[PDB]
Design an enzyme around this catalytic site. Structure first.
Site, PDB file in Angstrom:
ATOM      1  N   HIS A  61      10.511  30.193  23.753  1.00 23.89           N
ATOM      2  CA  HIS A  61      10.645  31.599  24.105  1.00 23.89           C
ATOM      3  C   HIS A  61      11.299  31.842  25.451  1.00 23.89           C
ATOM      4  O   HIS A  61      11.809  32.945  25.667  1.00 23.89           O
ATOM      5  CB  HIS A  61       9.301  32.337  24.039  1.00 23.89           C
ATOM      6  N   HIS A  91      10.034  30.877  35.429  1.00 25.32           N
ATOM      7  CA  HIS A  91      10.807  31.058  34.204  1.00 25.32           C
ATOM      8  C   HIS A  91      11.507  32.406  34.298  1.00 25.32           C
ATOM      9  O   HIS A  91      11.295  33.163  35.242  1.00 25.32           O
ATOM     10  CB  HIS A  91       9.909  31.019  32.964  1.00 25.32           C
ATOM     11  N   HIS A  93      13.218  36.005  32.070  1.00 25.80           N
ATOM     12  CA  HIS A  93      13.406  36.894  30.925  1.00 25.80           C
ATOM     13  C   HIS A  93      14.789  37.523  31.067  1.00 25.80           C
ATOM     14  O   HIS A  93      15.172  37.919  32.169  1.00 25.80           O
ATOM     15  CB  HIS A  93      12.335  37.991  30.916  1.00 25.80           C
ATOM     16  N   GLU A 103      11.653  42.890  32.513  1.00 24.38           N
ATOM     17  CA  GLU A 103      10.440  43.422  31.911  1.00 24.38           C
ATOM     18  C   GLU A 103       9.953  44.639  32.672  1.00 24.38           C
ATOM     19  O   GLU A 103       9.735  45.697  32.071  1.00 24.38           O
ATOM     20  CB  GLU A 103       9.359  42.340  31.866  1.00 24.38           C
ATOM     21  N   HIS A 116      10.141  35.111  37.160  1.00 25.87           N
ATOM     22  CA  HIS A 116       8.698  35.136  37.386  1.00 25.87           C
ATOM     23  C   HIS A 116       8.292  33.794  37.962  1.00 25.87           C
ATOM     24  O   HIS A 116       8.489  32.762  37.318  1.00 25.87           O
ATOM     25  CB  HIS A 116       7.931  35.384  36.091  1.00 25.87           C
ATOM     26  N   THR A 195       2.721  38.653  30.308  1.00 26.51           N
ATOM     27  CA  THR A 195       3.545  39.451  29.404  1.00 26.51           C
ATOM     28  C   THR A 195       3.865  38.712  28.114  1.00 26.51           C
ATOM     29  O   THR A 195       4.615  39.241  27.279  1.00 26.51           O
ATOM     30  CB  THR A 195       4.851  39.902  30.068  1.00 26.51           C
ATOM     31  N   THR A 196       3.351  37.497  27.943  1.00 23.12           N
ATOM     32  CA  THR A 196       3.416  36.777  26.680  1.00 23.12           C
ATOM     33  C   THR A 196       1.997  36.475  26.241  1.00 23.12           C
ATOM     34  O   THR A 196       1.080  36.444  27.068  1.00 23.12           O
ATOM     35  CB  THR A 196       4.177  35.449  26.808  1.00 23.12           C
TER      36      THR A 196
HETATM   37  N1  J3V Z   1       5.769  36.369  31.607  1.00 24.54           N
HETATM   38  S1  J3V Z   1       4.452  35.396  31.920  1.00 24.54           S
HETATM   39  O1  J3V Z   1       3.247  36.112  31.505  1.00 24.54           O
HETATM   40  O2  J3V Z   1       4.306  35.111  33.343  1.00 24.54           O
HETATM   41  C1  J3V Z   1       4.688  33.884  30.951  1.00 24.54           C
HETATM   42  C2  J3V Z   1       3.645  33.015  30.689  1.00 24.54           C
HETATM   43  C3  J3V Z   1       3.938  31.883  29.942  1.00 24.54           C
HETATM   44  N2  J3V Z   1       2.958  30.910  29.563  1.00 24.54           N
HETATM   45  C4  J3V Z   1       2.711  29.698  30.296  1.00 24.54           C
HETATM   46  O3  J3V Z   1       3.281  29.448  31.303  1.00 24.54           O
HETATM   47  N3  J3V Z   1       1.726  28.836  29.676  1.00 24.54           N
HETATM   48  C5  J3V Z   1       1.186  27.601  30.196  1.00 24.54           C
HETATM   49  C6  J3V Z   1       1.752  26.891  31.243  1.00 24.54           C
HETATM   50  C7  J3V Z   1       1.121  25.732  31.678  1.00 24.54           C
HETATM   51  C8  J3V Z   1      -0.064  25.314  31.081  1.00 24.54           C
HETATM   52  C9  J3V Z   1      -0.766  24.041  31.540  1.00 24.54           C
HETATM   53  F1  J3V Z   1       0.164  23.169  32.026  1.00 24.54           F
HETATM   54  F2  J3V Z   1      -1.669  24.346  32.512  1.00 24.54           F
HETATM   55  F3  J3V Z   1      -1.431  23.489  30.482  1.00 24.54           F
HETATM   56  C10 J3V Z   1      -0.628  26.038  30.049  1.00 24.54           C
HETATM   57  C11 J3V Z   1      -0.003  27.187  29.618  1.00 24.54           C
HETATM   58  C12 J3V Z   1       5.199  31.625  29.460  1.00 24.54           C
HETATM   59  O4  J3V Z   1       5.392  30.459  28.704  1.00 24.54           O
HETATM   60  C13 J3V Z   1       6.222  32.500  29.734  1.00 24.54           C
HETATM   61  N4  J3V Z   1       7.557  32.243  29.260  1.00 24.54           N
HETATM   62  O5  J3V Z   1       8.284  33.147  29.071  1.00 24.54           O
HETATM   63  O6  J3V Z   1       7.976  30.921  29.072  1.00 24.54           O
HETATM   64  C14 J3V Z   1       5.971  33.636  30.477  1.00 24.54           C
HETATM   65  N1  J3V Z   2       1.271  29.180  33.301  1.00 28.09           N
HETATM   66  S1  J3V Z   2       0.154  30.452  33.081  1.00 28.09           S
HETATM   67  O1  J3V Z   2       0.893  31.702  32.861  1.00 28.09           O
HETATM   68  O2  J3V Z   2      -0.586  30.734  34.313  1.00 28.09           O
HETATM   69  C1  J3V Z   2      -0.906  30.083  31.644  1.00 28.09           C
HETATM   70  C2  J3V Z   2      -2.167  29.468  31.661  1.00 28.09           C
HETATM   71  C3  J3V Z   2      -2.847  29.248  30.450  1.00 28.09           C
HETATM   72  N2  J3V Z   2      -4.180  28.626  30.391  1.00 28.09           N
HETATM   73  C4  J3V Z   2      -5.258  28.385  29.386  1.00 28.09           C
HETATM   74  O3  J3V Z   2      -6.182  27.838  29.870  1.00 28.09           O
HETATM   75  N3  J3V Z   2      -5.549  28.618  27.946  1.00 28.09           N
HETATM   76  C5  J3V Z   2      -4.971  29.172  26.709  1.00 28.09           C
HETATM   77  C6  J3V Z   2      -4.805  30.534  26.485  1.00 28.09           C
HETATM   78  C7  J3V Z   2      -4.253  30.983  25.287  1.00 28.09           C
HETATM   79  C8  J3V Z   2      -3.872  30.107  24.284  1.00 28.09           C
HETATM   80  C9  J3V Z   2      -3.271  30.632  22.966  1.00 28.09           C
HETATM   81  F1  J3V Z   2      -4.221  31.337  22.283  1.00 28.09           F
HETATM   82  F2  J3V Z   2      -2.208  31.458  23.203  1.00 28.09           F
HETATM   83  F3  J3V Z   2      -2.841  29.585  22.199  1.00 28.09           F
HETATM   84  C10 J3V Z   2      -4.055  28.747  24.498  1.00 28.09           C
HETATM   85  C11 J3V Z   2      -4.601  28.292  25.696  1.00 28.09           C
HETATM   86  C12 J3V Z   2      -2.235  29.651  29.293  1.00 28.09           C
HETATM   87  O4  J3V Z   2      -2.869  29.434  28.107  1.00 28.09           O
HETATM   88  C13 J3V Z   2      -1.000  30.249  29.260  1.00 28.09           C
HETATM   89  N4  J3V Z   2      -0.390  30.641  27.993  1.00 28.09           N
HETATM   90  O5  J3V Z   2       0.714  31.038  27.978  1.00 28.09           O
HETATM   91  O6  J3V Z   2      -1.073  30.531  26.769  1.00 28.09           O
HETATM   92  C14 J3V Z   2      -0.355  30.474  30.450  1.00 28.09           C
HETATM   93 ZN    ZN Z   3       7.437  36.023  32.598  1.00 27.06          ZN
END
Ligand code: J3V
Ligand code: J3V
Ligand code: ZN
Length: 257
Positions: A61, A91, A93, A103, A116, A195-196
């Site tokens: 994404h 990352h 958008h 966004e 972001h 936002t995701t």
């Molecule tokens: N727009 S936003 O809300 O800030 C936003 C949030 C996410 N999600 C994460 O970064 N998930 C994540 C990162 C590391 C871990 C770990 F390593 F801790 F397991 C676990 C989960 C994202 O993929 C994007 N994106 O667009 O790619 C934008």
């Molecule tokens: N890098 S970050 O933005 O700060 C970020 C941190 C986490 N941490 C979690 O502990 N758990 C979690 C929450 C939802 C899912 C589910 F339900 F989406 F699979 C799976 C695992 C994260 O999940 C994401 N993320 O994007 O999911 C992004």
């Molecule tokens: Zn973002």
């Protein structure tokens, strides 16, 4: 699963993630005339000189650059924040056209892209615990407008060919995120969400007033990434932004007049 298409995009997310209709969802439109100047806000403190980048990856994404967050190496303090937040990833958008892609909006104006920088509150020990807390994350948002090239972004641009499809990653060491910052750190701030999915309501948003400029050739290379995996039919990764959500009972604060 979820995505940004007609059949699985943001208008569908509430079916799997009911917090999508919650009380502190992001992004929002920043109405500059109703934002409240708050003199008690402090300057942001961005300490990135010791940052250790690790990998760049296409997660289907967006693309992210990850950092070593096992110590206080790259931290965000000050502003509206209590405590120390460690940089985990950044990352972007972006849009299919230069007039859309961000966004957050400012007086309904859309920018071409939004950067972001995601940080988590060290009091909670790991980022998984932090996402369960109302003050667990701080995301620094930076708007991108199309104009002159941003030299500090070029080395991200030059590696995107190697992560074209979802699941690809590459080593991406010694990248200095200070080259992505605008000159001024004046900001708006409000309590919001990811936002995701999972759309968790755990984020203090800090949105910088001053956009950075990137060139047309730089943003063009974002638009050549793929949502699909290798060996699948090509689907360009564009318009990976969530539309603005209702502000409800929140006030946006500004650090400046
Ligand atoms: N727009 S936003 O809300 O800030 C936003 C949030 C996410 N999600 C994460 O970064 N998930 C994540 C990162 C590391 C871990 C770990 F390593 F801790 F397991 C676990 C989960 C994202 O993929 C994007 N994106 O667009 O790619 C934008
Ligand atoms: N890098 S970050 O933005 O700060 C970020 C941190 C986490 N941490 C979690 O502990 N758990 C979690 C929450 C939802 C899912 C589910 F339900 F989406 F699979 C799976 C695992 C994260 O999940 C994401 N993320 O994007 O999911 C992004
Ligand atoms: Zn973002």
């Amino acid at each position: 699963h979820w995505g940004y298409g007609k059949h699985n995009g943001p208008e569908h997310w509430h079916k799997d993630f009911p917090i999508a209709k919650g009380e502190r969802q992001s992004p929002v439109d920043i109405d500059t005339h109703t934002a409240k100047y708050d003199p008690s806000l402090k300057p942001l403190s961005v300490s990135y000189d010791q940052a250790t980048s690790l990998r760049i990856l296409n997660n289907g994404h967006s693309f992210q650059v990850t950092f070593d967050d096992s110590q206080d190496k790259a931290v965000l303090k000050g502003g509206p924040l209590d405590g120390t937040y460690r940089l985990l990833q950044f990352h972007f958008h972006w849009g299919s056209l230069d007039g859309q892609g961000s966004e957050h909006t400012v007086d309904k104006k859309k920018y071409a892209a939004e950067l972001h920088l995601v940080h988590w509150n060290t009091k909670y020990g790991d980022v998984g615990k932090a996402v369960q807390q109302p003050d667990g994350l701080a995301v620094l948002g930076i708007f991108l407008k199309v104009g002159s090239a941003k030299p500090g972004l070029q080395k991200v641009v030059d590696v995107l060919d190697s992560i074209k499809t979802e699941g690809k990653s590459a080593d991406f060491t010694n990248f200095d995120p200070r080259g992505l910052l605008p000159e001024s750190l004046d900001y708006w701030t409000y309590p919001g969400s990811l936002t995701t999915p999972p759309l968790a309501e755990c984020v203090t948003w800090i949105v910088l007033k001053e956009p950075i400029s990137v060139s047309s050739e730089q943003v063009l290379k974002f638009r050549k990434l793929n949502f699909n995996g290798e060996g699948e039919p090509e689907e360009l990764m564009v318009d990976n932004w969530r539309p603005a959500q209702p502000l409800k009972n929140r006030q946006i604060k500004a650090s400046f007049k």
